Amino acid sequence: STSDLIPAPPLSKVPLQQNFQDNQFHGKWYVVGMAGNGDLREDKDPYKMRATIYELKEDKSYNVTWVWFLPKKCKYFINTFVPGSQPGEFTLGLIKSYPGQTSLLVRVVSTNYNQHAMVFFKTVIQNRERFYITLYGRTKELTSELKENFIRFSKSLGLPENHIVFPVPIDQCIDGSA
Ligand SMILES: O=C(O)CCCCCN1C(=O)[C@@H]2[C@H](C1=O)[C@]1(Cl)C(Cl)=C(Cl)[C@@]2(Cl)C1(Cl)Cl
Incomplete structure (x- = not known):
């Protein structure tokens, strides 16, 4: 009986990492x-x-x-x-x-610069709000605790279990000389 989109949260539910250091977030x-x-x-x-x-x-x-x-x-x-x-x-x-559209809001929710980053993205497509949360690593793996923390935040914005995935790490495309 589904819906096509989970409603976008109020931005008061999306915190920002305190004391953000632009130079320490740089890189892959x-x-x-x-x-x-x-x-x-x-x-x-x-x-x-x-x-x-x-x-x-x-x-x-x-x-x-x-x-x-x-x-x-x-x-x-x-x-x-x-x-x-x-x-x-x-x-x-x-x-x-890409020529397609003009609208993105980005908020870095949590990072320690050398291990993990969690980033909120919101865009408007065909007059309606789409939103994503990415959990990044400086390596291809993170601890049980940090992945569990990201599941808790995702659920706090109204996403069910079957809207959250941890892809198998890969070698193609993402290595190289980039
Ligand atoms: O071709 C187009 O109109 C859109 C192509 C995507 C632009 C580049 N880009 C991005 O700008 C980001 C990531 C990304 O790949 C990703 Cl996964 C997509 Cl798709 C978009 Cl849009 C976001 Cl905001 C997210 Cl994180 Cl959801």
Whole structure:
């Protein structure tokens, strides 16, 4: 009897990592966990994304490279994060590799820079809000405790168990010389 989208939370339910350090968040992060407000039987493209490179520029924006894994190829996207109202928050810049749309809000919820990062993303598609939570590692694995913490936060925003997945780590696309 499903719904197509879990309603977007009030941004008062999405905290920001205190004392955000832009230079310490720079570099490569691997996807350990991903959750979203779409039915995973329909919403397939976001779950192809298995790594991100965040390159801090002199102007305090990030040049952001997204790596997708497909069974017989890699795909890559580049877009620009402009610093928002508060350290750890960002909006979309107009430099990007795809013509499609203009709207992204980003909030870094928790990070210790050398181990884990948990990031909230919200976009508007066809007049309605889509939202995702990514759990990143500096390596391809994290502890039981940190993965359990991400499940608890995902559930606090109204996502059920079957909207939360931990992909099998891979070698294709996300290594290389990147
Ligand atoms: O081609 C288009 O219109 C959109 C292609 C996606 C732009 C690049 N990009 C992104 O901007 C991000 C991640 C990403 O890959 C991912 Cl998984 C997707 Cl899809 C989007 Cl949109 C987000 Cl916000 C998320 Cl984290 Cl959900």
